[PDB]
Design a protein around this ligand. Structure first.
Ligand SMILES: CC(=O)N[C@@H]1[C@@H](O)[C@H](O[C@@H]2O[C@H](CO)[C@H](O)[C@H](O)[C@H]2O)[C@@H](CO)O[C@H]1O
Ligand SMILES: CC(=O)N[C@H]1[C@H]([C@H](O)[C@H](O)CO)O[C@@](O)(C(=O)O)C[C@@H]1O
Length: 362
């Protein structure tokens, strides 16, 4: 499989790459992103976000640095953990978390992480160039309904979606100070003005939920989320654009994630030729446990045939992940094609999985 980002051979001399992202464009252009982890695999390090772009259905690629850290600290400055979406105008939005100090975003501080923010760039040229960074949290002009007890938040890590009427929804995660503890929860944010401003939904029902993606289904949002230490991906449904949540039984508990901490995964909607809406999820089986995150697999559910059990479609990365940082992945579906990007021993690899879609599409 093609090595999209190569720790061993890359224009930045980066030691390591993590947290890949993909969007298949309407015109067959492929756009991908990744954390450039200059010094190695650690989260709390010097990081920028790369793009790789391909006009030849992924034979060859053009690479750029799509977002730079705030350059304040040469050890700890980082923008990372990309969430993306393509608007109905075809604008491409990337939202990242920004820090410059040591220590986990959610758990290190008991008040608002002083160096923390959420930075956003957008592209109006099919991803050839990006705007300047736009700071979503410096003031209260850009995001409404942000809780006073916020420690930090960032996107869900993967892709957002667009509702019928053109509202953009991005998956998100937040850390909140609640009775002398820090608790993290998944939620969504939405923009009704092509990404210029945003409203924050409210948190899902269980804490310990973080990275996630939502699909739209007949006006509902359905979320598949990392639920740390539970051993599975949680799932919830919202009928009011993310103000309230209930447990979504068809998917809740259905994808197992093995012992230890959870792992990022992706969750996207496809409509097959027979009219059925299907969901596809990517995540490691993690049979070896903890951060090994072996066997990044693709699973499928049919929303129009709920009694049929979730099925493993294929295992694009049938290998143990690197314990220092692996397992993450991202699907993208557009115009009857299906691609995936994913971590593989410090590299990002890329595959076209369209043949698997054909098998499903029958
Ligand atoms: C459990 C342990 O011995 N050390 C942990 C960290 O590994 C863990 O952090 C996670 O580490 C993985 C490594 O593959 C990856 O870097 C994750 O992004 C990161 O969150 C942390 C969990 O809070 O606990 C430390 O003690
Ligand atoms: C630190 C951060 O913001 N992002 C990192 C998250 C969080 O550390 C955990 O969710 C705990 O909060 O986990 C990691 C992982 O699991 O491989 C990679 C990712 O870059």
């Amino acid at each position: 499989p093609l090595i999209l980002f190569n720790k061993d051979n890359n224009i930045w001399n980066s030691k390591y790459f993590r947290i890949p992202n993909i969007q298949l464009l309407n015109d067959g252009t492929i756009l991908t992103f990744s954390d450039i982890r200059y010094n190695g695999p650690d989260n709390h390090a010097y990081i920028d976000i790369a793009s790789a772009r391909s006009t030849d259905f992924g034979k060859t690629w053009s690479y750029d640095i799509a977002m730079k850290n705030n350059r304040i600290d040469s050890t700890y400055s980082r923008v990372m953990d990309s969430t993306t979406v393509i608007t109905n105008t075809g604008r491409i939005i990337l939202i990242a978390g920004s820090w410059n100090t040591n220590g986990n975003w959610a758990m290190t501080t008991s008040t608002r992480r002083s160096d923390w923010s959420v930075q956003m760039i957008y592209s109006d040229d099919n991803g050839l160039t990006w705007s300047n960074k736009i700071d979503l949290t410096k003031d209260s002009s850009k995001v409404k309904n942000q809780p006073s007890n916020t420690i930090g938040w960032l996107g869900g890590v993967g892709s957002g979606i667009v509702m019928d009427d053109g509202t953009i929804v991005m998956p998100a995660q937040i850390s909140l100070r609640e009775n002398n503890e820090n608790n993290y929860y998944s939620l969504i944010i939405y923009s009704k003005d092509n990404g210029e401003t945003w409203t924050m939904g409210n948190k899902v029902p269980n804490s310990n939920t973080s990275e996630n993606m939502v699909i739209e289904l007949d006006g509902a949002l359905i979320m598949s989320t990392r639920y740390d230490y539970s051993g599975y991906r949680a799932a919830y449904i919202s009928h009011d654009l993310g103000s309230t949540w209930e447990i979504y039984e068809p998917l809740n508990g259905k994808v197992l994630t093995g012992k230890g901490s959870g792992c990022q995964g992706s969750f996207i909607k496809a409509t097959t030729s027979n009219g059925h809406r299907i969901g596809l999820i990517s995540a490691p089986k993690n049979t070896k446990g903890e951060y090994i995150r072996d066997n990044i697999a693709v699973y499928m559910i049919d929303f129009d045939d709920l009694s049929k059990r979730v099925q493993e479609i294929c295992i694009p990365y049938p290998k143990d992940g690197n314990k220092l940082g692996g397992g993450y992945s991202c699907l993208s579906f557009k115009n009857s094609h299906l691609s995936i990007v994913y971590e593989a021993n410090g590299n990002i690899e890329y595959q076209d999985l369209t043949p698997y879609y054909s098998l499903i599409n029958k």
